[PDB]
Design a protein around this nucleic acid. Sequence first.
DNA 1: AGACAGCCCACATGGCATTCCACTTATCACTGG
RNA 2: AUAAACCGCCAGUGAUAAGUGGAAUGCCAUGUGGGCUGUCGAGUUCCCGGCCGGG
Lengths: 152, 150, 150, 362, 179
Amino acid sequence: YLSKVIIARAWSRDLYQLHQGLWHLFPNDFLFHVEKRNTPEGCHVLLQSAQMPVSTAVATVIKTKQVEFQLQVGVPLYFRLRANPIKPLIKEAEQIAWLQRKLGNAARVEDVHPVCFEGVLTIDAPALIDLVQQGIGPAKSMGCGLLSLAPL
Amino acid sequence: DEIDAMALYRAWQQLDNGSCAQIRRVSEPDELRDIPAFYRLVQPFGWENPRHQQALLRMVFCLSAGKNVIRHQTGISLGRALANSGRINERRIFQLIRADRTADMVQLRRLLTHAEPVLDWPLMARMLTWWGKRERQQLLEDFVLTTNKN
Amino acid sequence: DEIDAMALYRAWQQLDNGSCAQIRRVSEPDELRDIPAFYRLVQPFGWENPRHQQALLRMVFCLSAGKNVIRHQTGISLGRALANSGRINERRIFQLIRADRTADMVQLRRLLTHAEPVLDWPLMARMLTWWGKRERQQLLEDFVLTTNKN
Amino acid sequence: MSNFINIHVLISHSPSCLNRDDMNMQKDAIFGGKRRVRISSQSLKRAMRKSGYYAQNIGESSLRTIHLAQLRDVLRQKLGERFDQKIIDKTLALLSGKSVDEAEKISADAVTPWVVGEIAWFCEQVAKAEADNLDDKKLLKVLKEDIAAIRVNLQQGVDIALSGRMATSGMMTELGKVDGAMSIAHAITTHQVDSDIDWFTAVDDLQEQGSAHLGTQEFSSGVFYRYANINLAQLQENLGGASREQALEIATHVVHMLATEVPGAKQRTYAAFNPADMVMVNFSDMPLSMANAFEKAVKAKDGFLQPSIQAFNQYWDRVANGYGLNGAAAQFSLSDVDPITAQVKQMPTLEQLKSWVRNNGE
Amino acid sequence: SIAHAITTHQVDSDIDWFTAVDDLQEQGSAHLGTQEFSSGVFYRYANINLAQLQENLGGASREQALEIATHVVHMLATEVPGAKQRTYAAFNPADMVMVNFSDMPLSMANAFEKAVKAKDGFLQPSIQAFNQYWDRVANGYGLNGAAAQFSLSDVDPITAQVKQMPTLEQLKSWVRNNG
DNA sequence: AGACAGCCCACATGGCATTCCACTTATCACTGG
RNA sequence: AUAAACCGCCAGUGAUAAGUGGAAUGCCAUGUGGGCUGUCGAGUUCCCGGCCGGG
């Protein structure tokens, strides 16, 4: 389920506060990506989750579009994969290569730049759907590993 | 080390319309402290002597009754001149005495405005610096005995 | 549990150019809350306790006039030193007194920049923490008086 | 039918400084809990008086002086053609109550408004009395009998009939002292304002190593609510028994200025030549000011103007329905924010609103 | 009378961070700095009182005044302050210039009190705001004065009580001949 | 991690009201050493 | 163990009734904040599975 959450200021200052505050939405495994930080209402956040988040008094939820994945190999999609490369990879080549390791296995990249990775990739469909569910790389509970697809 | 009452009197007479007016607007005596022209007027006359300024405040405030209600000539008591006006009723004076501190200076100024009195200024200045239960009492006594002479 | 003003002064003096300058950049005093170097500087001095921080803010903002415009020596008041400069005109000091809250801190800092003043820092500091009710009046008094001796 | 005409104006100025105090600071004012920028009633009034619109449509403004020497010199020219000098001098002396001897400087009690036409008429009377060997006091008694005759001279100078005269010393003390037909309020901003400070430089073409002057100036943009009241019977009286149509004429001219006129300072450097975005006019039995609509200082949404007009309409709705007012009302606005209470008739152009006031709310 | 120019829209200023690189130290910078800067769509306004101008020149003719006035229009459309132009180079020409004769001076600044929101940039909606508001003021306050407008991009047309100048030089000529 | 300018400069003028007004009455104890 | 010792100045009581501080009033004219400037350099650290991978 795709949610649009805002975390209050006193409860989003630190990153562990972000993880705990977004953990507390589930009284019933997830991935989160930060759109904007330090607005007066706190953190503006796009949230991918297994379950449907319940609005806390620190983490308000604005909407929840559930998704079901319809992917076709060959189809071109924009993508923003916010992720974090390490072994910390400072070189540009190394970052792009890293991307095209995971995604190279699933779906070829046709363009990209940088870490928030913005670009265009082309698509195996089940392998990729699987990969999106899984997340990509380190710090999956620190804001990284969330890939969002967008059609052209 | 007292305050040269006459020099101060003349100093107030010599003020520019801007300042005579600037000080006259004042409602309570302490607001004088917000006026720069005040500090300028008073400072030679021993302001900046802490133990002097309360007195200085009162003197200036009474002059500040304006424009020239206080007119100078054994000496003439304030009580005496207030009676010699004939405008002021005994009850009002009693009230001057019965009122607490700041109020009493305010009320007095109102009286001065109404009476337009002919005193002996430096005397009134002395009485005004030492202002105290005794001084008040004397104001009463002079007033009644004078108002009774008449 | 007061703020050790001289300790703060020396701490400000001891800052690395990066932080001293980083704080110097601030336009208004509240923007001090966005700089980490502020938090670091204030941190020993008790910014942790609310109603310590407004004072600390004003004190630092006045230091941030930079680079060393505030030079420390009965004590010497801010009003006094502003007059001792002789660069500053009365009308500006008036605008400072009359000024609304944040603006008043700003214009003050501007004055400090202009005067390169020789004060007694902790005195002015204290004056700054309680700023200002009497303090405004008090600084006016000091300025006019010092300016008139001259 | 209704005696009071209320004029409500919402006008937004760009960054400017339209009223300074002794410290050349803007004129602050607090309402109901927040600072508002203020333009003084006096500035407004004099702006309208001294205005070209006035000169074109009302006539001559009054002559306000405390200096009788200059006055007697002026009156000596104009009425010097119309009357004997000895007579003029004496007329000024009676009205003034001050002695008009040739001396360089002669001063009245206080600054006073004068109308030359008025003085002319008084000169006629003094001429009649002096020739008839009438005593001054007797003359005063006779002139007391018909006040209106003295007030029609007001029609020549209207600002006096609008905002009034005070007298302390002369024959004027007895006959020519006038209550203002129009009561006006200092205009204030609908919203909170923290004043900006502009930091200026004067650059000296002859020194290279610096500026010749450094300074600061207060300034603000603001949405202002102007309010004004015209008492109609009073205006008719102050003009010497003029009709409701003459009154309403003056009322509309005032509306026009109230919507159109901006004080002169420091317009040459800030140029806030802004027109009113909202003008609303209502007839009533008892005067009403909508300032309370902004006691809650309006918070900006799409600017200050729109939510201010909104606030105005909403309050007027509450007041009009609460106190059951059923007076003629019309509103002209530049923005598309419509009024809630019918009947507030909507005027597309100011001229239509003005014609509506002339026809007495139709 | 001239007004401080204001941006039609809200502006959050960017901050540029300087480094001064010292050829004699190889490791660090010799200086670090900051500078506020923004891009912006600005509204300039100015009014010329003609009678006053004629007076101030000692009884100069209306045509001399208009001459000076055209000169002003040109500069107002053309001149940008010099700082810090050598490092930021905002040598931009005006995209919209409008001149109107009237009985009472009028500022269109109110067209932008509602801070203009970017649509396809700020310029286009700024001109939109201006024109619609001009229409409203002109019809509401019933002014019928000589008005001409020159722009690089209308969207936007004002109802045509404004003569449209394809070039500024023509606008200038229109003012010189008094409408 | 390291580093974070400097100089120079800060206005003058003139103006601050008047008129008139300021209570009166009833009433102020007795007892004991 | 002191002109000392013992040793009450006590009791009762409204200060009350009436009252506009008021009329007039631009704070105003003048003013560039301005000249100089690569963000480079760089791989830093909490537990479990054979550099790689999960909180």
